[PDB]
Amino acid sequence: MKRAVITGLGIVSSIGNNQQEVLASLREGRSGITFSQELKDSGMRSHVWGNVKLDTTGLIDRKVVRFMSDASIYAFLSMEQAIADAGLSPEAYQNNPRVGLIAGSGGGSPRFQVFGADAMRGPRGLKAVGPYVVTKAMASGVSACLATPFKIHGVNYSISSACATSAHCIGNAVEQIQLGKQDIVFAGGGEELCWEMACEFDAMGALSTKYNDTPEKASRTYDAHRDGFVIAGGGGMVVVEELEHALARGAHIYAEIVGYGATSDGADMVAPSGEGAVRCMKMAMHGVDTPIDYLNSHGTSTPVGDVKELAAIREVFGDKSPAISATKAMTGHSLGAAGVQEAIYSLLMLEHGFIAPSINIEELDEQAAGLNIVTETTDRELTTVMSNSFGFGGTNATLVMRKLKD
Amino acid sequence: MKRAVITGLGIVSSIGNNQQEVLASLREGRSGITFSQELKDSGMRSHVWGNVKLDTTGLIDRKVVRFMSDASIYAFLSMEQAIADAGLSPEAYQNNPRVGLIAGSGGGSPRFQVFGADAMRGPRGLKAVGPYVVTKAMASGVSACLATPFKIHGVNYSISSACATSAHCIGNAVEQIQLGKQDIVFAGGGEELCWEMACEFDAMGALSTKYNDTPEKASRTYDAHRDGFVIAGGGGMVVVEELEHALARGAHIYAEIVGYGATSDGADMVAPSGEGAVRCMKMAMHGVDTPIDYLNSHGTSTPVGDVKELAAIREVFGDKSPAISATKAMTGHSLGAAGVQEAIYSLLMLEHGFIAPSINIEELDEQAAGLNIVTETTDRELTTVMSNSFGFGGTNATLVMRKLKD
Ligand SMILES: [N+]
Ligand SMILES: [N+]
Numbered sequence: 012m013k014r015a016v017i018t019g020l021g022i023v024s025s026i027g028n029n030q031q032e033v034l035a036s037l038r039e040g041r042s043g044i045t046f047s048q049e050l051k052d053s054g055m056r057s058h059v060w061g062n063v064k065l066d067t068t069g070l071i072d073r074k075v076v077r078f079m080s081d082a083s084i085y086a087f088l089s090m091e092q093a094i095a096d097a098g099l100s101p102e103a104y105q106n107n108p109r110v111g112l113i114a115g116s117g118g119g120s121p122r123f124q125v126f127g128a129d130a131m132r133g134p135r136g137l138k139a140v141g142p143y144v145v146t147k148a149m150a151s152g153v154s155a156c157l158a159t160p161f162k163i164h165g166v167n168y169s170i171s172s173a174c175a176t177s178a179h180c181i182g183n184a185v186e187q188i189q190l191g192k193q194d195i196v197f198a199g200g201g202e203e204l205c206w207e208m209a210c211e212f213d214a215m216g217a218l219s220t221k222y223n224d225t226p227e228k229a230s231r232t233y234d235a236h237r238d239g240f241v242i243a244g245g246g247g248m249v250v251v252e253e254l255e256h257a258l259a260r261g262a263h264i265y266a267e268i269v270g271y272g273a274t275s276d277g278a279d280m281v282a283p284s285g286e287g288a289v290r291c292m293k294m295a296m297h298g299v300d301t302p303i304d305y306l307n308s309h310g311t312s313t314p315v316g317d318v319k320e321l322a323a324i325r326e327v328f329g330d331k332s333p334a335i336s337a338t339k340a341m342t343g344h345s346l347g348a349a350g351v352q353e354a355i356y357s358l359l360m361l362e363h364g365f366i367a368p369s370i371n372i373e374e375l376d377e378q379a380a381g382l383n384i385v386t387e388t389t390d391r392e393l394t395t396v397m398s399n400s401f402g403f404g405g406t407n408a409t410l411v412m413r414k415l416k417d
Numbered sequence: 418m419k420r421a422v423i424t425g426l427g428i429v430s431s432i433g434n435n436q437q438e439v440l441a442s443l444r445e446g447r448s449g450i451t452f453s454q455e456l457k458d459s460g461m462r463s464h465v466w467g468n469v470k471l472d473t474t475g476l477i478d479r480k481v482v483r484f485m486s487d488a489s490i491y492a493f494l495s496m497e498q499a500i501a502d503a504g505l506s507p508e509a510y511q512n513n514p515r516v517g518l519i520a521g522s523g524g525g526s527p528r529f530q531v532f533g534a535d536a537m538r539g540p541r542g543l544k545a546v547g548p549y550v551v552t553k554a555m556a557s558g559v560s561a562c563l564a565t566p567f568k569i570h571g572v573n574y575s576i577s578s579a580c581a582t583s584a585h586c587i588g589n590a591v592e593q594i595q596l597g598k599q600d601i602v603f604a605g606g607g608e609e610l611c612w613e614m615a616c617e618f619d620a621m622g623a624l625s626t627k628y629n630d631t632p633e634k635a636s637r638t639y640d641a642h643r644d645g646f647v648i649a650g651g652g653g654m655v656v657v658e659e660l661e662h663a664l665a666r667g668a669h670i671y672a673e674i675v676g677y678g679a680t681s682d683g684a685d686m687v688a689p690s691g692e693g694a695v696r697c698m699k700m701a702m703h704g705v706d707t708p709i710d711y712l713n714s715h716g717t718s719t720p721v722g723d724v725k726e727l728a729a730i731r732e733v734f735g736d737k738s739p740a741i742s743a744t745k746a747m748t749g750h751s752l753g754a755a756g757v758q759e760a761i762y763s764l765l766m767l768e769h770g771f772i773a774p775s776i777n778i779e780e781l782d783e784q785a786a787g788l789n790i791v792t793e794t795t796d797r798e799l800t801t802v803m804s805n806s807f808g809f810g811g812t813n814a815t816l817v818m819r820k821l822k823d
Pocket of ligand 1: 308353400
């Protein structure tokens with residue numbers, strides 16, 4: 012019954028430590044990919060990544076950060092940004108049963124997982140491991156480490172679904188409002204960046220390895236010469252709020268979440284089926300009387316993945332193909348954080364009336380012909396935008412965000 | 418106002434590889450805890466665990482199990498059981514957009530996360546890692562590895578919330594039914610058992626260490642001399658179905674999920690606040706006018722935890738305190754799988770009309786005086802039951818189930 016709107020946002024990414032820096036990188040088509048000595052020293056073939064250029068030292072209370080892994084740190088910082096940007100203060104969101112938090116990561120924390128095991132196998136055993144590994148390594152790290160410090164009393168858990176993680180978190184936050192269970196739910200996610208996790212994707216042959224010489228060119232979605240995605244880290248958080256509650260406090264509304272699709276391929280364990288994406292996007296558009304002006308694709312810069320989604324988009328729109336661009340060409344694939352970060356990039360485009368350019372397309376892919384793939388920053392009054400997230404295991408999420416009518 | 422009921426269950430636990438085996442253990446007060454040479458050799462202080470007594474080799478198609486970690490294997494097997502128990506044919510649940518899956522684990526797969534790191538640092542590097550580590554180590558492994566094989570086309574993601582994990586999965590499934598989004602949702606979870614993850618808890622002082630010589634006596638919820646929980650592994654899965662859909666196909670209905678609570682402490686990172694648990698139980702009892710005949714407590718056998726929950730129970734029911742037992746005294750703490758497995762123990766008790774005993778109470782804690790803690794198998798006609806799951810990070814979940822008329 013209730014309607015859900017976004018009244019605040021926060022982000023820590025490879026292209027910016029806040030919405031202002033991110034906004035700048037987007038309009039400039041700036042890349043956040045750099046060379047990683049860490050990735051190379053570990054023995055990996057991929058030597059590039061989208062790291063967060065930020066010294067988080069002292070940004071979080073000692074007693075709070077002690078239980079956190081990088082995924083939680085990034086998300087926590089993003090939640091602080093979202094809270095302020097939303098105009099909310101402790102007395103309104105803390106110790107409030109009507110306020111919740113749904114945020115997760117794609118891989119929890121392989122770094123502290125490996126750290127624990129390594130320390131344990133040392134001569135110090137349990138003493139070397141320390142009593143803080145559990146909250147850093149568990150899959151619910153991102154929600155646990157934020158809900159406690161921020162005095163959250165409402166819902167509190169993490170949803171995980173690979174590349175769609177933070178997208179489902181947002182969707183589930185919407186469901187909480189529609190059900191009348193919560194007035195506000197902070198939704199988002201975070202993902203650390205480390206060789207410990209990245210080597211898993213490399214050994215799987217999913218990471219780019221032919222552009223370690225030119226980092227900024229590795230992520231080239233839709234480019235006939237693409238050879239895998241560039242792994243990234245970071246966080247993002249949005250304030251999902253019930254409409255009347257937002258209007259009552261004079262909140263600043265970025266947009267309304269008019270659509271939320273969640274489906275499953277039930278086909279391949281690693282590659283997309285397309286059939287699932289089609290149903291997902293259509294589910295998100297069901298009921299929306301306005302057309303999609305911009306579509307922030309999943310496009311991770313992979314041979315099959317890129318083309319599969321485009322084929323799914325054709326099936327859904329046909330001759331009504333909206334503007335399309337893969338921001339991952341700039342940011343990289345932050346995995347669990349991608350969902351909320353990309354949703355934010357879309358909100359920034361909707362809020363500032365512009366479309367981010369799909370960079371590094373030196374030679375468009377034949378199977379991408381007949382579509383409107385924007386490769387240059389173009390100014391335009393967007394009204395309804397769409398964001399897709401398709402992760403391993405055939406899990407699909409689609410969000411449709413539209414401006415509010417005055 | 419859709420109603421959700423349970424029409425099938427499946428389980429792989431320390432006390433049984435199917436509902437018949439588990440039924441027997443519950444009635445007999447049989448312990449599923451054994452001595453673990455693995456834990457001892459790892460350098461841990463806790464040398465006991467609730468292990469699955471079953472060789473899973475060859476039970477799952479080679480091409481399917483190749484992507485799975487133990488959490489997924491246990492959950493997968495549990496799901497096969499739930500499907501058969503619910504009487505669902507392949508064409509009744511496969512390739513069906515109205516059929517989904519919501520299942521997760523508390524820690525993904527620390528073993529394979531460590532394996533990948535160990536292998537990567539070896540003389541083979543990437544080659545030793547292999548292309549199956551991602552689907553085994555990621556937090557969403559349990560939903561990803563099941564949705565694909567079972568051809569699920571509906572919702573597909575994992576919920577993570579430590580000890581409450583599979584409980585939230587069930588609650589979220591109920592939400593999908595109430596929202597009219599799905600007719601059937603398989604809900605549950607799995608958790609591997611390994612020193613890699615276990616040492617983390619031991620290093621936190623959360624595991625029992627004074628009863629390694631008498632494994633079956635280590636887990637003793639409410640006993641004055643309790644000293645931590647006994648870690649365990651396993652899986653569980655239930656079929657959450659919309660009432661009309663189940664009735665039309667003549668399904669066997671165990672009970673209706675008449676209440677679902679989900680709250681947050683927003684206080685301590687590893688200790689329960691109690692205040693959050695009170696709200697969670699009250700939320701699950703909203704609209705439930707039938708009395709609680711039996712309460713399956715979270716009671717992990719920890720000094721502070723056990724009594725915190727009893728206090729919360731006293732505040733909720735006052736002088737209307739229901740019969741109580743902590744099945745963890747027999748089974749150990751399966752973490753991510755505890756929610757669904759205990760919901761299953763609760764459903765067996767309700768289906769068969771008996772209350773399993775809260776074993777190993779040689780000296781009842783003084784703060785439990787006045788309560789109705791059942792220490793011996795008692796036959797009785799139950800109608801409404803409650804099962805609590807409170808995980809680290811201050812995340813709470815409560816489920817209330819009730820028998821349907823005639
Ligand atoms: N996206
Ligand atoms: N329980």
